[PDB]
Each structure stands twice: as C-alpha cells, then as structure tokens.
Design a protein around this ligand. Sequence first.
Ligand code: 0BW
Ligand code: CL
Ligand code: CL
Ligand code: CL
Ligand code: CL
Length: 303
Amino acid sequence: VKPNYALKFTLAGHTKAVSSVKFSPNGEWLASSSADKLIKIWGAYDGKFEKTISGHKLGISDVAWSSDSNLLVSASDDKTLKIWDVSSGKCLKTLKGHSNYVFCCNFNPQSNLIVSGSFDESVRIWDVKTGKCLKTLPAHSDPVSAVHFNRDGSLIVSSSYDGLCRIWDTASGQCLKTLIDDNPPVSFVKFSPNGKYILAATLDNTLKLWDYSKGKCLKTYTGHKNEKYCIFANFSVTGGKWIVSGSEDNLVYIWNLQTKEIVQKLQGHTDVVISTACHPTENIIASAALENDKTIKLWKSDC
Ligand SMILES: COC(=O)c1ccc(N2CCN(C)CC2)c(NC(=O)c2cccc(OC)c2)c1
Ligand SMILES: [Cl-]
Ligand SMILES: [Cl-]
Ligand SMILES: [Cl-]
Ligand SMILES: [Cl-]
C-alpha cells in the first residue's frame, strides 16, 4: 500500500552539481555524472566509492549503461558523447557530430546502438562498434531533454522544450507519432517497462502517463515542484507499482501509479533533486541533487 524508503547512504565526492544516477542492469553498480566533468562508480548495496572515470572537457548531463553492465555512455557540454569501458576506465570512442551541448543518452537493449539528444535540437543514432553517427533526426525545434529506447529498441521516444513528445521508428528514423496535448516544455520522457506507456514530465509541475498506441493521457501525477529543471522520473517495479521523481522543493516524490496518490516524500537533500533511479531487483532508490548539495543518496524500502 505505501513504501517506507529510509536513508541508507549519502555518497559524497562530486565537486559540482550531480546530473544523473543510473543502476547497472546487473544491479551491482551505481554510475553518477556531474557538472564537475566526472563519472563516478559506486557499489549499489554498500554505497562504497569504486572509481572516477575522466576525459570529458566540460560538464556531463547524463550517463547510461550497456545491457551487459560493461559499458557506459556519457553526454557532455563538450558537444560529445563518450563510450567507456567501466572495468578499465578507458574511453573507447568519442562520438562527434552534435553542434552544441549533449543532454541525454541511452543504449538500446542489444547495446549495438546509442541514442542522444542535444541543445542543437537533433536526436542522433550512433553505432557503438564504429563510434560513427548512423542517423541524424531533425527531431525538435528547441533543446532535446530526453531520449529513450523501448523494450526491444524498435522505437525511440524524445522530448523537447518545444513542448512536444515524439516517437521514432529506430530502423528508418521516421517519426511515428507526436503526442497531442498546451505545449509547456517537455523536460523528461521514458517508455514503461512493457513499452505500452510513456511517462512524460512538463515544466508546469506535472507528470503524465500516456498510452502510446491510443495517443491518450491515462494518468496525471501532481503535488511536486517542477518548473525549471529537467528532472528524471521512474517506474518503480520491484515492490509496489510506483512513479518516482525528484522535485525542486528538494524532496523525492513517490506516487501510486494507478491511483495517482502521493504515497511517500523523501527528505534529506539540500538542493533540487534532479535525478532518481530505481534498482532493477531490490526496493532501492538512488537520488542526486544540484550544487548546494552535490551528494547522491541511497534509500531502501520493505515494499
Ligand atoms: C535547455 O535544456 C537544458 O539546459 C538541459 C536539459 C536537460 C538536462 N538534463 C538531461 C539528463 N538529466 C539526467 C539531467 C538533466 C540538462 N542538464 C542539467 O540540468 C544539468 C544538471 C546538473 C549538471 C549538469 O552538468 C552539465 C547539467 C540541461
Ligand atoms: Cl525500428
Ligand atoms: Cl509496464
Ligand atoms: Cl513499444
Ligand atoms: Cl530507474
């Protein structure tokens, strides 16, 4: 009915705002990225700092794992993405093509591809092996805030400050759908685990669950504050079925997915919680905050 997330660890080390936290698909690791130009790896269960991965010339907005938990991709203000071998810490490829800040990135399920979104208003599809750009989608007319592959990688969902959420056929690069809604900036977008729904944040303090096939809004989640930052949200699926998001009032919000009620609010951070991640098997949340805080928090619940 209601989760009971409690603080287990506070992870200090970043020297500027943290931008993104992600659990490795194998559950073993947390990766974090920051305005400090660094990627850090931490033990998911003991919160133990593992290593720092460096190479970007400017700050990093996003980081994402390959399906085998061996590779990471990062998205940076230096206009590049970098592909990293986590075990060695080495940059395997630098992905060059965007003409401004890169804000978001993801591997596909196979992990032969990377998708990216940029201030330059494009979505790019990259070949992991060669490090070359396969497709450039003229996706939006303002900065791209988020990009995400569906369950099998056949679709890409993108969001933008232009107020649109668009769905793309990965193979052809063709737009399959623009969600019909007002047009406040769409600050975040993610497919549901089954690929049927899309969770979308807009900068009017609102999260929406969309039915992809129908192009219809099914659920709305409110009560939090989100009018300025591109705050990441999540489907929590290991215990109760929740929606999880950071907020500009420094809290982590948790809603019941079906009823839309706020079921928990997590207090502790001292700046905007820009990023949250949900562990793939345990009832564990990671959260991260902006420059007044600079820490990552790990929380655990019984359900
Ligand atoms: C006009 O659009 C933007 O300026 C913009 C959009 C999305 C961003 N992301 C996208 C990915 N999230 C995980 C983090 C926030 C970000 N990145 C950040 O807000 C951000 C936060 C902390 C550190 C950081 O270092 C570059 C960047 C910026
Ligand atoms: Cl496809
Ligand atoms: Cl689902
Ligand atoms: Cl789908
Ligand atoms: Cl997650």
